[PDB]
Each structure stands twice: as C-alpha cells, then as structure tokens.
Enzyme design. Structure first.
Site, mmCIF file in Angstrom:
data_model
loop_
_atom_site.group_PDB
_atom_site.id
_atom_site.type_symbol
_atom_site.label_atom_id
_atom_site.label_comp_id
_atom_site.label_asym_id
_atom_site.label_seq_id
_atom_site.Cartn_x
_atom_site.Cartn_y
_atom_site.Cartn_z
ATOM 1 N N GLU A 1 0.857 -1.178 0.000
ATOM 2 C CA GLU A 1 0.000 0.000 0.000
ATOM 3 C C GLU A 1 0.897 1.233 0.000
ATOM 4 O O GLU A 1 1.694 1.419 0.923
ATOM 5 C CB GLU A 1 -0.940 -0.060 1.200
ATOM 6 C CG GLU A 1 -1.816 -1.324 1.152
ATOM 7 C CD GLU A 1 -2.717 -1.385 -0.099
ATOM 8 O OE1 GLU A 1 -3.759 -0.712 -0.102
ATOM 9 O OE2 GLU A 1 -2.390 -2.098 -1.077
ATOM 10 N N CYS B 1 -0.727 9.635 3.873
ATOM 11 C CA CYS B 1 -0.747 9.157 2.493
ATOM 12 C C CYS B 1 -1.958 9.695 1.739
ATOM 13 O O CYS B 1 -1.908 9.856 0.517
ATOM 14 C CB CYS B 1 -0.763 7.629 2.466
ATOM 15 S SG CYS B 1 -2.041 6.891 3.515
HETATM 16 N N1 LIG Z 1 -1.379 3.417 0.861
HETATM 17 C C1 LIG Z 1 -1.380 3.653 2.262
HETATM 18 O O1 LIG Z 1 -2.320 3.277 2.961
HETATM 19 C C2 LIG Z 1 -0.255 4.390 2.909
HETATM 20 C C3 LIG Z 1 -0.379 4.686 4.287
HETATM 21 C C4 LIG Z 1 0.604 5.423 4.983
HETATM 22 C C5 LIG Z 1 1.733 5.810 4.283
HETATM 23 N N2 LIG Z 1 1.888 5.483 2.923
HETATM 24 C C6 LIG Z 1 3.077 5.925 2.259
HETATM 25 O O2 LIG Z 1 4.154 5.711 3.125
HETATM 26 C C7 LIG Z 1 5.141 6.638 2.776
HETATM 27 C C8 LIG Z 1 5.717 7.265 4.040
HETATM 28 O O3 LIG Z 1 6.171 6.317 4.967
HETATM 29 P P1 LIG Z 1 7.729 5.996 5.106
HETATM 30 O O4 LIG Z 1 8.453 7.287 4.869
HETATM 31 O O5 LIG Z 1 8.022 5.355 6.434
HETATM 32 O O6 LIG Z 1 8.030 4.974 3.895
HETATM 33 P P2 LIG Z 1 9.265 4.246 3.394
HETATM 34 O O7 LIG Z 1 9.081 3.676 1.968
HETATM 35 O O8 LIG Z 1 10.294 5.239 3.582
HETATM 36 O O9 LIG Z 1 9.589 3.280 4.483
HETATM 37 C C9 LIG Z 1 8.623 2.294 4.801
HETATM 38 C C10 LIG Z 1 9.191 1.040 5.479
HETATM 39 O O10 LIG Z 1 9.956 0.284 4.554
HETATM 40 C C11 LIG Z 1 11.196 0.074 5.179
HETATM 41 N N3 LIG Z 1 12.191 -0.053 4.143
HETATM 42 C C12 LIG Z 1 12.981 0.926 3.564
HETATM 43 N N4 LIG Z 1 13.735 0.363 2.618
HETATM 44 C C13 LIG Z 1 13.467 -1.002 2.547
HETATM 45 C C14 LIG Z 1 13.937 -2.055 1.796
HETATM 46 N N5 LIG Z 1 14.939 -1.842 0.794
HETATM 47 N N6 LIG Z 1 13.449 -3.285 1.979
HETATM 48 C C15 LIG Z 1 12.502 -3.553 2.913
HETATM 49 N N7 LIG Z 1 12.023 -2.543 3.679
HETATM 50 C C16 LIG Z 1 12.478 -1.283 3.514
HETATM 51 C C17 LIG Z 1 11.424 1.193 6.131
HETATM 52 O O11 LIG Z 1 12.366 0.888 7.108
HETATM 53 C C18 LIG Z 1 10.053 1.344 6.679
HETATM 54 O O12 LIG Z 1 9.797 0.483 7.737
HETATM 55 C C19 LIG Z 1 4.532 7.645 1.854
HETATM 56 O O13 LIG Z 1 4.933 7.444 0.544
HETATM 57 C C20 LIG Z 1 3.080 7.405 2.017
HETATM 58 O O14 LIG Z 1 2.318 7.839 0.936
HETATM 59 C C21 LIG Z 1 0.886 4.772 2.217
#
Ligand SMILES: NC(=O)c1ccc[n+]([C@@H]2O[C@H](COP(=O)([O-])OP(=O)(O)OC[C@H]3O[C@@H](n4cnc5c(N)ncnc54)[C@H](O)[C@@H]3O)[C@@H](O)[C@H]2O)c1
Ligand SMILES: Cc1cc2nc3c(=O)[nH]c(=O)nc-3n(C[C@H](O)[C@H](O)[C@H](O)COP(=O)(O)OP(=O)(O)OC[C@H]3O[C@@H](n4cnc5c(N)ncnc54)[C@H](O)[C@@H]3O)c2cc1C
Ligand SMILES: O=C(O)[C@@H]1CCCO1
Ligand SMILES: [Mg+2]
Length: 1207
Positions: A786, A820
C-alpha cells in the site's frame, strides 16, 4: 528547553464550583438529566388546565388565518416550482430592472434560457418542505424547459415577483440595517421590539472577521441612532455570533480568543453601552458553550462597561448543561450587579451535534435525543429564570404555542415591561405573537430576531430555518399538518415524560457513538478536548508519559537481543529525548524468521476465535491506555493531540474489526501462509503497524514486525500490548531498525508473505526481491503493498467556499501533510478560483506550527531533517520556475526541530508534478468547466489512485466525475483523509496499491492459502462479455471450459454495491469494479480459456502474451469479446496492467514473475497456477484479486442539515 506538556492546555481561569457543575453535565446520561427537569417544570393542575386553554385558543387563532398558490395557478410539479424559483433568483441578480424584464420577454420566455440551480436545495425546502443534500440539475433543467415552453413569460414574471417578496421581505427583515430599521416601524407600533442580526458566522480568515466586526459596529450605530434613548427593554438591540469575530474561535485556541476576540466584543459592547441598547451573544456549537462563558465573565466584571444592563446571552435548552449554565449566569449577575439579558432557546444545531458526537466517538451527546426532552428542559429552565427576574431579564424565544402558554401562566398575573419578554424569529413567529402582544391579547411583549443581509450572506442561517420549518417534530410544521389535532398540539410534555416507562430514555433510533456498529463490534472511544475535566486529566497523563523510559529492543521468540542503541529525539525539539532503540542485526532478523517458522504450527493451532479474543483484549488495553499512548505518539512522531487520538482509535478499530471478520469467516480449511513480514511506515506509527500485524496474526500466521526506523518506541509498546493480550512471543517478534532489517526479513528463506505500507519506490524494491522467490508449493510469495498518492480535489462553482477551505486546510496540512491520503492538488473552477484562493491563503496564516505538546498547535514538524531537506528542495524548484508560493512564517522556536511551513504553490499544469511530495505542500490549478472531463484524465494520468475529493452540489457532476476517476477512496463534500475502519475501507490502485484494502472485508483472505467467502461478498450481476465468451466456448466444443466460464460468472462479486454502517449525515458506500487490463501469460489453450474466463467474469480487459503461440486458439471471437482482448509482444509497451494471471511449471512462473516485476509503473498482483492445478481446482485463480474495491464517503449534511433526522 520547556518541560514536555507543562503548558498543554491550562484553563482560562480556575474552575469555580459553578463552572465545574456545568462541565460535569456535559454528556450526562439522558435518564439522569430528565427527572430533576420534570420536577422543576411541574405546575399545579389549575395552571396546567389554564395553559391548555390558552394554548388551544392560540392554535385555533393560528389555524383560522404564496409559493403554493403559484404552484396551483400554473399546475407546477414540485421540480418545476423549484426550477422556477432558481430561475427567479438568478433573474433578480440582474440589477437593471428594465434589462432583466427585456431578458425575460425576448430571450428567456422565447426559448433557450455557474449552474442556475446552485441553491435548489434551499428552494426545494421552500417548495416541498424536504431537504436534499445535492441537486438533480438535469431534472431541474428539464422541468424549467417544460414549464417555460408550456406557460411562457407569465409564469416567469409570477416567479420573479414571488422570489422578490420572499428574499427581500420574508427571508430577511432588510438587505441593509437601514432598510431593516425602516421596515420595523410597523410592528414596533403594535408593541413588538427588535434584535438585529447582521448575518455572519464562522469567519474563515482574519479579513472575514474584520468584515463582520465592521458590519456589527455600523449596525450598532444605526440601531442606537434609531433607538434614540428608548433603552434596552423598549428599544431595539443587536445580536452577534462570536464565531463571526475570530477565525480560530475554539477551546484549543483559548489564549488567542481571550487576547484577540475579547477586546473586539468589548469594543462593540462599549458602543452599545453608549447608545443604551441590548447586545446579545448568540449560542452556537456545544463545544463553544463553556469558552463563551469565559468571555461573558470578563465582560460582566469589566468596570468600563458598568452602568449598562444591555449585555445578553443565549442558553440552549436542548443542552444537558442548560440549568447549570443558568445557575452560573444568575450568580455572575449577582456578583457583577449587571442584570444579564438571558435568551432561553431550544437550540438550532441539533442534527450537527448528533453527527459530531458520533464521529468523535464520545461518551454521549451534549444535547437531548427526544424532542419532548428539550421541551421539558425548556420549561424547567424557565421556572429557574422566573424566580430570578430581579437579577436577570428572561427572554423566552419560542414559536411553540404550548411552550408559550405554559410560561405565560407560570409567570403569573404581575407583569411590567422589563420583567421578561418573549422572542420570535422574523417571518416565523408573527402570526403567533400577533395573538400575544397588545392590551387586547395577552399584553406581553415580543422581540423579533431580525436577520439583515443580502441573498449571498444568508445561506447557512436560512437552511437552519427551513429545516426547522419542515422537521416532523417542529411545532411550526405540525401546526400546518391536518393530521395533527389541536389536542395533540396542547399535550403537556412534562406529564407525557413523567408517564413514560423509562423517564429520559435515549431515542430508540439514534445510536450512541459506541454503538455505531451494533452487535458486530464496539466502536473505539475518543476524548473530548473541549472538556476541562478531560484536559486536566489528560495533562497529568501526558506529563507522566514523558517521564517514562521508553525503549524498543529486538524482541525475538527467545528473549530480547543485543544490538546497536541510539536515542529517539522529538522531531519538534531535538533537545527532548523520548527514549532509546536497540536495532536488529541482520543475523538476528534471519534468526527471527527461523524461530517464526518453527512456531508456525503452534500458532496456527490456536482456534480462530481465541486468536480473535487476543485482538479484542489488546483493543481493550489500548483503549484504557490511550492517554499514555497519546503522549508517546505526540513526542515521537510529531503528532498533535487530535492526530494522536485518531491514531489510537484507528488501532483499536483495526484490532476489533479483524477480530470480528475472523469470527465471521475463518475455519480449518483456511490455512495460514506461514511467517509474514510486516513492514510499516513512520507516519501512522501505531495504526498501520497494528493493523498489518493484527490481521496477519489473527489469520494464523506468526509475524515479524519491522517498524519504521523513525518511530520504534510506539511500535514496541504496541507489541508489548499484543503480547500482554495473549499473543505468544514466538508468534509476534519485534525487529527495530532501518530498511536493511526489512530487506533481510523479506529475503529470508522461510518468509511466506509480506505486508508493506510505505513509499512506492521501496515497494518496487521489495517486489523485485520477491520476483525470484517461490513458496514450497511453487507459487509466488503474496505481497500486499500500500503505497503513495498524488491526491486531488476538484471544486466547481456550486461548492460553498467556506466548506471547501476548511476541508482543504485539514486535508492538505493536517499532520504537516504527512498522511498518504493528504490533499496534494486542489483543482479550482476558473470562475471561483480567485475567491477561494484568497480565503485559503487567509486560513493558512491562522495555523499554529510548533512542538506538538501544546493543544494550541495545529501543525507539527516533519519527521526528519532529510524529509525537510527533500520537501524544501521541491518548494525552491517550484519557486525557481516562477510559480506563486505562499508560506506561513515560522516562529523562532521551531529552530530546535525540523519544521516545514505549510505552503501553497500555484501550478500551470498538473504535469508540473512528478512524484508524491510527502509534506505540507498544497498545489493549486485552475480549470474551465468544459475541460472537467480532460481534468479527470490528467488526474488519472499521474498513475496514482489513492484518495480523491469532489466538492459540488450538482448530481450530474457527481455522476460524471465519480464514474471517470480511478481512485480507491472517494470523498464527496468533505475532507479526503477519512479512513474509518470498516466504514471507509482504505487503499488505492495503480501506483498507490495492490490491494486488498486494509480495514475492508477482502484483507484477511489474502493472508491464508485458501480465501474464505467474506461477509456480504456476492453479486447477482453476470458480466455480459463473460457470457458471450462462454457461448463461444460451447460453439467451439470446449464444453468443460464453457461450464467453468459460466461458474466464474456466477462466483464473481463484480457489481457488489453496499452501504456500510456509520455516522448519521454520511453515506459510506463500498463497491466492487473491474481492475482494468489484466496481463495473461498462458501456457496451454485450456489454460488460456480459464484465464480469460476469470478475467472477463470480473469485468476486465486482457492483454495476452503473444509469445505463447496461442493466437490460433481465439479464432472468430464475438466482437464483444474481441473488444476486450489484445495481444502483447512487448508487455512494457502495452501497460499499465492491473494484475496478471500466469500458467506454467515452477521455473516458468519464476521467469514470468521476474519479467512482470520489471514492467514500469504499478506493482501487479500476480496469480500463478500450473496446468494441472487449473484442471483440478476451480479456484486456481481467485476472483477476489481480480476486482477492485472502491470506497465512497458522501457528506449528506453538506447542504446544512440532515434530511433523515428531519423525519
Ligand atoms: N497506501 C497507504 O495506505 C499508505 C499509508 C501510509 C503511508 N503510505 C506511504 O508511506 C510513505 C511514508 O512512509 P515511510 O516514509 O516510512 O516509507 P518508506 O518507503 O520510507 O519506508 C517504509 C518502510 O519500509 C522500510 N524499508 C525501507 N527500505 C526497505 C527495503 N529496501 N526493503 C525492505 N524494507 C524497507 C522502512 O524501514 C520502513 O519500515 C509515503 O509514501 C506514504 O504515501 C501509504
Ligand atoms: C428569537 C430566537 C433566537 C434564537 N437564538 C438561538 C441561538 O442563539 N442559538 C441556538 O442554538 N438557537 C437559537 N434559537 C432557537 C432555534 O433557532 C429554533 O428557533 C428553536 O430551537 C425552535 O424551538 P421552538 O420552541 O420554536 O419549536 P419547537 O417545534 O417547539 O422545538 C423545536 C426544537 O426542538 C429541538 N429538537 C428537535 N428534535 C429534537 C430531538 N430529536 N431531540 C432533542 N431536541 C430536539 C430543536 O432544538 C428544535 O429546534 C432562537 C430562537 C428564537 C425564536
Ligand atoms: O443562527 C441561528 O440559526 C439561531 C437562531 C437565531 C440565532 O441563532
Ligand atoms: Mg524512508
């Protein structure tokens, strides 16, 4: 460095005994409020009989003495009458009377006559007495054409003269205060007096507040000149609304209210004093009542206002605090020596109070829920006022002849002008009070509340009136109902309530906020940040939470693990150390997955209802600990108190929703996947974290929980709570750390599925790592991903600017835009863009940005310096391209944290934006109405599809836009950040998500090897192209595949269309649509036929791999099926796709999966099967994952009232 929460929400003054008695009643149960009101309102048998006679005499006079006559004369249908009045209104906007008359005569009457019908909801109430939230503008256009073609210029002229009378004479006393004063002469000579209201409320900007102030000030001069020394009782006065005089009139901004609003009211009061006229403070929403008392107190104690007894104050008898408010006011009158004018009313905001309490999950309503309870409360409070006429001046505002009679006889035979008076609203109460005022009637005075303004400024007040006039429960409606007898109308509410089985029982058909979902589950409870007891208790709990030594450690099945440790700093002030995190080594992350795999059979053996009971126990623990959890979220994640309440409520709701969905669905044949890796974002650090984990656990999977590196502490506390609730340590392991930890977990051999919420770019890396992996059964590892959004709101010229600006400010800048769902692109119709933009910029500058441990802070910091640097680079590039940039100035105190000021950027094209900018940055574009459909294309063309908003009153525009937009969560006439679990199931498409939706009914089914049938999940619709394809198969002799196709058509839930339970004044819809174009990668002819049946039965088109060599298998397709089928040699050229179906052995599936992951754009939900599984299992390809869920939330109170609660 200030101590955390040491200045969270100090009250304006220490709460006296009398003030605390008010607060104690705020949401008191209705069965506890009524008995003392019944006793206070009781009168003698003789008085009751006398009052019934007076009431009967009044009602008989009322019943014994122009729109309906226009409808009759020209045989108009209801829609024709509404359309005619809309036309008349528009014609009256032409000032030059001869110019209008010539347009009528030569152009309108002869044929082809901003939508003409923007205000049809209002005219609908005038004509039909019924309220519609939105306007069927195609029906109205057809009706106006019909009536003009039938009756021509005469009917147009009659409509114009009818509108002119109602708008100039009935809806308002006058267009200007001078006009209103000239028209007041007639009734002042018959014994009435007046209180003038310069229409105006709910200031959005400082400029609006100054405009309303100078309106009030100029009216005081005119009324005082006209009063010419008649004094406060026999001469006219003014009424004001505090919300008109400050754009941030709320308890959260109490300091600004006392420092900025109070001196403005004092200046107006000083002028009223000099002219010796009344100045009344109108009563508004329940959460402003006690705040308004602090202003009343200061004014009445201010020596500069001494000598003047004209200060007045409304109290609402539909409110549970009313008698205690009156005790406070009567005592303040004694202390100050001022004879306060007290207007006793029932109350004007009832529908809105019901909806608000349900939305906020509060303990009870602040108003009664049975209309007769408000009547008893009124009469009880009148008895209190009539005992204190030496110290206050009671003003009994009512149109109800029974209420009036009861008070007239309660007051007794001694009367003098100045003892008390009655009051009524202009255009509603004069028929009644012409039977009251004057020596030949009851010889009691009446003050008319006189609205003053143009048709523009009149809307909100007018709709509150028309709803009042048409509500089934209203006296003024029932007086006109022939089916209501005079005996029913004079029934004594006091005795009717006394005789009920349960005195004061809540209305049978209004749910308490806790009961919105009935027997399915208990709604999460919020906290009332307008309640001083709540704020005092929350202050202490928040401070105590800042004294706790929060930690997050790697919590493996065997115990905590060692690792590298660092502090966690408050993003709003890096001097405030929140706790410490020990991060997970990649060795221990791999060990955790192995321990999870070893523990998988044990956890799967816990029966589903016992797994669900763990989730329910955890929700209870989170509810009980909410104050402490709020404190952590506020300091670790930069959330305001309101943001943090919503966060904890969401977590409670996930727990209880997935628990109930489990009890409704899971059995022995729904086997778990195995160890599931849950990777979560920083920005919803408890809600999304808990939701993914709870769903995976309750489906029978052990979980590896990898929280965002930014926010490990609240995650550790969530895991601690779930373990306390009964989740074994082997079933739920916490692995703090950065993306390396997430990547090590995803790559671990025994990882059986991944739940990811985060950025699209990171999801794409996880997709790539999974592309080379298969389960032991040789099938893809399921991924729920998501991801981001590029969320738009479209606003046309029928929308209400003040509503739009409030929903834009909330959607774009709540949580500093770090949702988001946040609004990224506001699209304004060209004709209203300048006005809305100006209001939006004014509202922007009223926001308070700072460290979030103060109730007064609206917008907190961004999460890190890297986030700040990333956002600021986007702003400065836009500024360098020449785009208009508006920014709030930040206080110097923000220098200790990482803040980005809320920002508005005016764009030329929607293509000015590339990727999601996750911060407080609103982009604005303008469009011409004829380009609306192209605009929807541009929005779709970003490739995102998460949230989308539309502000319009026009049904044609709703139907067009909502049918063409491609987004998972739609919002009509409200903000776009709603994600109430089980009400707005949340999740998007394209670059925004794979699905299924979190908080929706398809979610748990993805976390088991065989999906159950979700509750309510079926559809009687059969896709017609599927049917054509099944007939084609039979024609070709493929009888088994034709039967399978017909079965897929039946089993598909395409076309499901449900309304989900929720709050009043909202419709929350859930629908299943086609996903789009599905990539088919077949290996055999029969496999292709099964893949095509699966895709067509769910409404999709297909692109079929040309490299399959199966082109000869689709010879002579019917055109209906051919239209849905394309052949693809270069898959990356023919996308984007919305999913894929693959046939082959394990190595073929692996190779195809890698090719699919390499395709540009959205992550694709891929399903794979061998040729043998297609032969053996009818559900080899699962139809759950070939439809797209869409949630739509419509604010049906947006026209200013609730039609359902009217009836
Ligand atoms: N569609 C939804 O319901 C929804 C909800 C909330 C946030 N978001 C999205 O989340 C984002 C913001 O959150 P964020 O900044 O924490 O996101 P992110 O992509 O920076 O990080 C998310 C998670 O993935 C992990 N991660 C980072 N690199 C990885 C890798 N190579 N392999 C596996 N895991 C990895 C991070 O440690 C973290 O726990 C925004 O883009 C927002 O739009 C979407
Ligand atoms: C001069 C004047 C000034 C006013 N000023 C204000 C003000 O400053 N602020 C304000 O909020 N109101 C104010 N009101 C009251 C409001 O605008 C309505 O006019 C009033 O509530 C209608 O009451 P009634 O005795 O005329 O009619 P009724 O038909 O006797 O009573 C109707 C009222 O019952 C209440 N009600 C309806 N359904 C329910 C239910 N299911 N459960 C509980 N209660 C229910 C509502 O208050 C509704 O308005 C004012 C009224 C007048 C006449
Ligand atoms: O604004 C309203 O609708 C009520 C009625 C008069 C003042 O407050
Ligand atoms: Mg990141």
């Amino acid at each position: 460095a200030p101590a955390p929460f040491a200045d969270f929400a100090p009250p304006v003054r220490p709460q006296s005994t009398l003030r605390r008695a008010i607060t104690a009643a705020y949401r008191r149960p209705e069965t506890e409020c009524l008995p003392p009101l019944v006793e206070a309102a009781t009168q003698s048998k003789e008085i009751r009989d006398a009052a019934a006679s007076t009431a009967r005499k009044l009602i008989e006079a009322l019943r014994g003495k122009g729109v309906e006559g226009l409808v009759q004369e020209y045989s108009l249908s209801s829609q024709e009458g509404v359309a005619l009045m809309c036309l008349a209104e528009a014609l009256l906007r032409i000032p030059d009377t001869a110019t209008r008359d010539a347009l009528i005569r030569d152009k309108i009457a002869d044929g082809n006559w901003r939508s003409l019908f923007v205000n049809a909801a209002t005219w609908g109430l005038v004509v039909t007495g019924k309220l519609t939230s939105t306007v069927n503008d195609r029906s109205l256009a057809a009706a106006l054409t019909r009536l003009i073609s039938r009756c021509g210029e005469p009917v147009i002229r009659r409509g114009v003269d009818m509108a002119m009378r109602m708008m100039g004479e009935q809806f308002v006393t006058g267009e200007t205060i001078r006009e209103a004063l000239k028209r007041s002469k007639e009734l002042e000579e018959k014994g009435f007096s007046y209180s003038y209201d310069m229409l105006g409320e709910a200031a959005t900007t400082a400029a609006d507040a100054e405009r309303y102030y100078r309106d009030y000030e100029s009216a005081i001069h005119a009324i005082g000149k006209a009063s010419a020394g008649r004094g406060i009782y026999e001469g006219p006065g003014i009424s004001i609304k505090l919300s008109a005089l400050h754009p941030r009139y709320s308890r959260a901004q109490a300091a600004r209210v006392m420092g900025e609003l109070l001196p403005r009211v004092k200046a107006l009061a000083l002028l009223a004093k000099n002219y010796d006229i009344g100045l009344n403070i109108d009563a508004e929403e329940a959460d402003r009542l006690e705040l308004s008392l602090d202003l009343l107190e200061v004014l009445c104690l201010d020596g500069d206002l001494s000598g003047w007894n004209g200060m007045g104050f409304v109290v609402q008898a539909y409110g549970k605090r009313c008698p205690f408010v009156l005790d406070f006011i009567i005592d303040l009158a004694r202390r100050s020596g001022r004879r306060i004018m007290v207007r006793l009313v029932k109350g004007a905001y009832w529908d809105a109070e019901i909806k608000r309490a349900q939305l906020d999950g509060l303990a009870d309503f602040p108003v009664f829920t049975r209309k007769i309870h408000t009547d008893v409360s009124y009469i009880a409070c009148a008895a209190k006022l009539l005992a204190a006429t030496d110290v206050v001046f009671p003003q009994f505002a009512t149109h109800n002849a029974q209420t009036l009679a009861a008070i007239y006889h309660m007051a007794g035979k001694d009367f003098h002008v100045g003892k008390y008076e009655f009051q009524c609203l202009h255009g509603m109460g004069e028929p009644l009070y012409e039977e009251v005022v004057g020596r030949g009637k009851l010889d009691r005075p009446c003050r008319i509340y006189a609205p003053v303004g143009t048709h523009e400024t009149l809307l909100a007040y007018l709709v509150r009136r028309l709803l009042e006039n048409g509500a089934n429960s209203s006296f003024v409606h029932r007086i006109n109902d022939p089916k209501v007898s005079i005996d029913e109308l004079i029934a004594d509410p006091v005795e009717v309530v006394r005789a009920m089985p349960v005195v004061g029982a809540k209305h049978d058909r209004i749910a308490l906020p806790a009961e919105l979902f009935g027997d399915a589950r208990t709604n999460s409870a919020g906290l009332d940040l307008s309640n001083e007891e709540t704020l005092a208790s929350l202050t202490e709990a928040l401070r105590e939470s800042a004294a706790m030594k929060w930690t997050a450690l790697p919590q493996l099945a065997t115990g905590p693990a060692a690792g590298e440790t660092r502090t966690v700093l408050n993003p709003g002030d890096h001097r405030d150390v929140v706790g410490s995190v020990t991060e997970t080594s990649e060795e221990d992350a791999r060990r955790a997955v192995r321990l999870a795999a070893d523990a998988a059979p044990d956890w799967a053996a816990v029966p589903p209802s016992e797994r669900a009971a763990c989730l329910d126990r955890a929700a209870e623990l989170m509810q009980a600990r909410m104050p402490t959890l709020l404190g952590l979220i506020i300091r670790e994640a930069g959330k305001s108190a309101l943001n943090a309440i919503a966060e904890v409520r969401e977590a409670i709701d996930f727990l209880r929703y997935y628990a109930e969905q489990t009890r409704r669905t899971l059995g022995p044949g729904h086997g778990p996947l195995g160890p599931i890796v849950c990777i979560s974002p920083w920005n919803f650090p408890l809600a999304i974290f808990t939701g993914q984990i709870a769903a995976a656990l309750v489906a029978g999977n052990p979980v590896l929980a990898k929280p965002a590196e930014e926010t490990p502490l609240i995650a550790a506390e969530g895991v601690r709570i779930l373990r306390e609730a009964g989740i074994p340590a082997s079933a739920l392991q916490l692995l703090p750390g950065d993306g390396r930890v997430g990547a090590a977990l995803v790559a671990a051999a025994e990882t059986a599925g991944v739940m990811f919420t985060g950025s699209t770019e990171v999801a794409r890396l996880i997709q790539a790592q999974l592309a080379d992996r298969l389960s032991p059964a040789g099938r893809p590892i399921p991924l729920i991903a998501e991801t981001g959004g590029q969320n738009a709101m479209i606003v046309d010229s029928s929308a209400l600017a003040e509503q739009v600006v409030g929903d834009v400010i909330t959607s774009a800048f709540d949580s500093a835009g770090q949702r988001c769902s946040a609004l990224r692109v506001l699209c304004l119709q060209e004709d209203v863009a300048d006005r809305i933009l100006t209001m939006l910029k004014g509202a922007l500058h009223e926001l308070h940005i700072g460290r979030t441990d103060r109730l007064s802070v609206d917008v907190g910091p961004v999460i890190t310096s890297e986030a700040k640097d990333n956002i600021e680079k986007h702003i400065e590039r836009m500024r360098g391209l020449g785009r208009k940039v508006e920014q709030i100035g930040l206080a110097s105190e923000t220098g200790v944290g990482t803040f980005v000021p809320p920002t508005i950027i005016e764009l030329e094209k929607l293509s000015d934006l590339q990727r999601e900018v996750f911060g407080p940055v609103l982009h604005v574009i303008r469009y011409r109405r004829d380009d609306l459909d192209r605009l929807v294309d541009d929005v779709n063309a970003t490739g995102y599809g998460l949230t989308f908003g539309l502000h319009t009153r026009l049904d044609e525009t709703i139907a067009h836009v909502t049918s063409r937009i491609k987004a998972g969560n739609l919002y009509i006439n409200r903000n776009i950040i709603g994600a109430v679990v089980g009400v707005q199931p949340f999740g998007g498409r394209g670059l925004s998500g794979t699905g299924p939706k979190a908080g929706g009914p398809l979610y748990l089914g993805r976390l088991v090897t065989t999906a159950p049938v979700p509750p309510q999940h079926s559809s009687v619709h059969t896709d017609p192209v599927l049917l054509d394809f099944a007939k084609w198969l039979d024609g070709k002799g493929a009888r088994a595949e034709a039967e399978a196709a017909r079965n897929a058509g039946s089993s598909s839930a395409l076309g499901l269309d449900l309304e989900l339970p929720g709050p009043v004044g909202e419709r929350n819809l859930y629908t299943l649509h086609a996903r789009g174009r599905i990539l088919l990668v077949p290996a055999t002819e029969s496999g292709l036929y099964h893949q095509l049946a699966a895709a067509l039965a769910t409404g999709n088109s297909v692109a079929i791999d040309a490299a399959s060599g199966l082109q000869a298998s689709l010879k002579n397709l019917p055109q209906t099926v051919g239209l849905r089928v394309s052949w693809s040699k270069d898959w990356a050229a023919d996308g984007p796709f919305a999913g894929a179906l693959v046939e082959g052995d394990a190595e073929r599936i692996r190779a195809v999966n890698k090719a699919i992951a390499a395709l540009p754009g959205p992550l694709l939900l891929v399903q794979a099967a061998s040729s043998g599984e297609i032969a053996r299992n009818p559900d080899a390809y699962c139809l759950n994952w070939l439809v797209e869920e869409v949630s739509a939330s419509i604010n049906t109170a947006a026209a200013g009232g609730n039609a359902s609660l009217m009836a």
